[PDB]
Amino acid sequence: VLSEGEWQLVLHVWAKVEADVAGHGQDILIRLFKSHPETLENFDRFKHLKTEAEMKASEDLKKHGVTVLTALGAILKKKGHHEAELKPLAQSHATKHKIPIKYLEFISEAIIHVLHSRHPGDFGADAQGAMNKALELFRKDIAAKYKELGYQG
Ligand code: HEM
């Protein structure tokens, strides 16, 4: 369970993301795909993309990054009270998309990497620790829902 102070560190960097969620989403999805190419294969929608340049030029990838980060932001703004937001997400990701917890760990790493690069002013060590805790909580709760839904993750 995060403290209020930790949540405030999370939300203060998220405020920066929200200056340009689209650009942040591009960087995060591209970092995920570059660092863990098997994750790209998981997206039938995107797996044709061959290069970072093609990724950057895809309007469709940009749209999806906005969707992803806005969903995550809505979860983070609940400060742990995210049951309602996690239900549909866990169901789609367990049963339609089939995303293992290890891949949610990979996107978490990509989020931390991009925030660390873009936001040294709001992403020092304590802030990164807080974000890690928030993403750990998200993954813990999603993995519990995966169980309940019949997916090992
Ligand atoms: C922070 C973690 C993530 C969030 C918040 C998130 C959010 C979303 C949202 C909101 C959608 C659209 C609605 C839905 O289907 O549920 C979606 C779709 C999808 N997600 Fe995620 N996602 C996350 C991580 C991942 C990861 C790590 C992968 C794969 C490695 C993945 C694969 C997919 C796929 C395949 C779709 C469908 C894309 C399409 O064909 O339109 N997601 N995600």
Swiss-Prot record:
Localization, UniProt: Cytoplasm, Sarcoplasm
Main location: cytoplasm
Disulfide bridges in this chain: none
Transport found in the keyword field: yes
PROSITE patterns, per database record: GLOBIN
GO cellular component assignments: extracellular exosome; sarcoplasm
Domain annotation Globin: ranges: 1-147
EC number: 1.7.-.-, 1.11.1.-
Top EC class for this record: oxidoreductase
Recorded catalytic activity of this chain's protein: Fe(III)-heme b-[protein] + nitric oxide + H2O = Fe(II)-heme b-[protein] + nitrite + 2 H(+); H2O2 + AH2 = A + 2 H2O
Described function: Monomeric heme protein which primary function is to store oxygen and facilitate its diffusion within muscle tissues. Reversibly binds oxygen through a pentacoordinated heme iron and enables its timely and efficient release as needed during periods of heightened demand. Depending on the oxidative conditions of tissues and cells, and in addition to its ability to bind oxygen, it also has a nitrite reductase activity whereby it regulates the production of bioactive nitric oxide.
Assembly and binders: Monomeric.
Binding locations of heme b: 93
UniProt binding sites for nitrite: 64
Family: Belongs to the globin family.
Protein's name in the database: Myoglobin
InterPro entries xrefs: Globin, Globin-like_sf, Myoglobin
Record has Oxidoreductase as a keyword: yes
GO biological process: removal of superoxide radicals
Keywords: Cytoplasm, Heme, Iron, Metal-binding, Muscle protein, Oxidoreductase, Oxygen transport, Phosphoprotein, Transport
Gene Ontology terms, MF aspect: heme binding; metal ion binding; nitrite reductase activity; oxygen binding; oxygen carrier activity; peroxidase activity
